[PDB]
Design a protein around this ligand. Structure first.
Ligand SMILES: [Zn+2]
Ligand SMILES: [Zn+2]
Lengths: 337, 5, 333
């Protein structure tokens, strides 16, 4: 029944009292008397100790030490001594610990996971490297396209030489070169109609990032609603990084839920058919990173993925993030009544 | 934010 | 004087009228008729045409047309045909969407020298983005060897690289992706305020390193005594962070805005600190840091972190910036 202060907690005299912990969990306590007692209690836990073995070394009243202990424990500033077991994924461990999770356990869930990356352009490139190096067991690369030179902007795993080769091929080569303890596989396919979706295997989650055709997302959705298959969308609209929704069968809203005359209508169609995204690495990467963060959480099960029932957008030309509601609707034409 | 990803 | 519609514009029927543009420029138009008129004039520029011409082309009232033209030109949905000319091709629509001549922006970048003071997580990511975007010369600064525990964030390193010098590998991997760029390495680690002098002069310094702790305070004060621009980037566990971007005589910096018993425990506990790394957070901070460098050097748009330290949460939907503009009462400026 040992507890130990996590190495990720930093304290700091601030304002009247002080700060405890860093990041999203940072707590500000105004009462100097209390803040100081928390510091004294935490100090007693630097070495794996039990509640009592720690109180004995404390020079404060058992009542206070107790309130300080409760503080530290709920915010996960102190965690079970067992959660501290040189590994290649050692870095990620502190992260999981900070969320009250068991590193080992989490890592275990990732290893037994199978993830599918649909469309290996800019998004699937970054998502796959994050997932691969984080410990995802199997990755299925689904893309029947070829590397060009103009692709060397957001596709971080490619070198010019690779030009002419298959994306799915180069990614695997590059993924294994970074983590040989996982398995990668390719599927020469390109979702053209709705029928092609049957060609994609079953898996913990599907990362859908390719943007073609216009209503590709809509078929992946439709299909996945009936296939009870979890999936997450990612991409961008020019300068806006976008990720989500993260669809989960029976516990979340689907893409369609919360959803031009004669000559003008043809003009609309011609201008759009003429559309080509204004790609930009920074935007592509923000979208990929946050998408991957959500896939690791959804699978690791230690914190709530952000894009559950939401389509999130992060701007690049202004400090702004905004999410569109996509919660379950009983009145849905895809998975409703 | 009102179109494809 | 020819004008051409951008490929990055999109349109759709929505609510009462429609949407024109995608991304931050996306504007909703109420008047269904004004919408329809906007697409009608935009239609005359799928293929390049001058003002006068399009006018004698589209059958819309010279009044309504003029309005639609200016609208499209001001939002940059329509640009000078000359701006529509390559390796950095996919980046041209981005600069075009901000009303800049991609070739000129692509040129400012080619003639820039960027220094990456820290080749770990942020360094790796910032470094590959600048290189593949065209930053002409990049100075990689550091004195550490690749480890196994690093393959988690340093997207450039492989298992077969473990042990080698970071700058050595980052440099190889960069030239491998953009063979027309000039990279270089300097085996150095800032251990004291006197180490900074050993760091070259450049358009901007990407301060990624986070050791010692008070390295950013050191750099702030030094960069002011060298009139050197720098942008800090990193993370506070699960919160990505980038900025401020310091620009001599234009913005502010990291300086503007005794009970011995406890202070002991405090120091002892803080010395055991270890950051709670997470690649997603790392990547976001680096992506945005790089977007700011590319903008600062390309002048086509305002960097987001000018006078500001931005934070992007990861366990919560939230972005927040701590303003810190110029200030007189400072220990550096
Ligand atoms: Zn539904
Ligand atoms: Zn100052």
């Amino acid at each position: 029944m040992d507890y130990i202060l996590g190495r990720y907690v930093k304290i700091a005299r601030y304002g009247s009292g002080g700060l405890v912990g860093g990041g999203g969990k940072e707590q500000y306590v105004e009462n100097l008397v209390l803040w100081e007692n928390i510091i004294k209690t935490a100090y007693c836990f630097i070495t794996p100790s039990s509640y009592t073995a720690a109180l004995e070394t404390a020079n404060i009243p058992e009542k206070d030490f107790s309130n300080c202990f409760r503080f530290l424990k709920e915010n996960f500033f102190i965690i079970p001594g067992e959660y501290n077991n040189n590994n290649r994924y050692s870095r990620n461990f502190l992260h999981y610990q900070s969320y009250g999770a068991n590193p080992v356990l989490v890592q275990d869930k990732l290893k037994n996971a199978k993830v599918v990356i649909l469309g290996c352009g800019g998004i699937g490139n970054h998502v796959s490297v994050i997932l691969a190096t984080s410990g995802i067991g199997e990755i299925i690369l689904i893309d029947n396209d070829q590397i060009e030179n103009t692709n060397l902007t957001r596709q971080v795993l490619f070198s010019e030489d690779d030009v002419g080769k298959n994306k799915t091929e180069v990614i695997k080569r590059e993924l294994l070169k970074r983590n040989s303890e996982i398995s990668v596989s390719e599927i020469a396919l390109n979702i053209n109609d709705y029928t092609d979706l049957h060609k994609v295997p079953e898996a913990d989650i599907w990362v859908v990032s390719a943007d073609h055709p216009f209503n590709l997302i809509n078929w992946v959705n439709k299909y996945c609603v009936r296939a009870n298959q979890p999936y997450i969308n990612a991409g961008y609209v020019n300068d806006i990084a976008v990720f989500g929704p993260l669809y989960v069968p029976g516990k979340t809203g689907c893409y369609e839920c919360q959803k031009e005359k004669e000559n003008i209508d043809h003009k609309i169609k011609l201008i759009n058919s003429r559309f080509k995204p204004a790609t930009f690495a920074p935007v592509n990467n923000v979208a990929a990173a946050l998408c991957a963060a959500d896939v690791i959480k959804f699978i690791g099960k230690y914190s709530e993925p952000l894009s559950l029932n939401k389509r999130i957008g992060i701007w690049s030309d202004e400090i702004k993030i905004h999410s569109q509601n996509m919660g379950r609707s009983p009145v849905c034409s895809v998975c409703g009544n | 934010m009102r179109t494809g990803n």
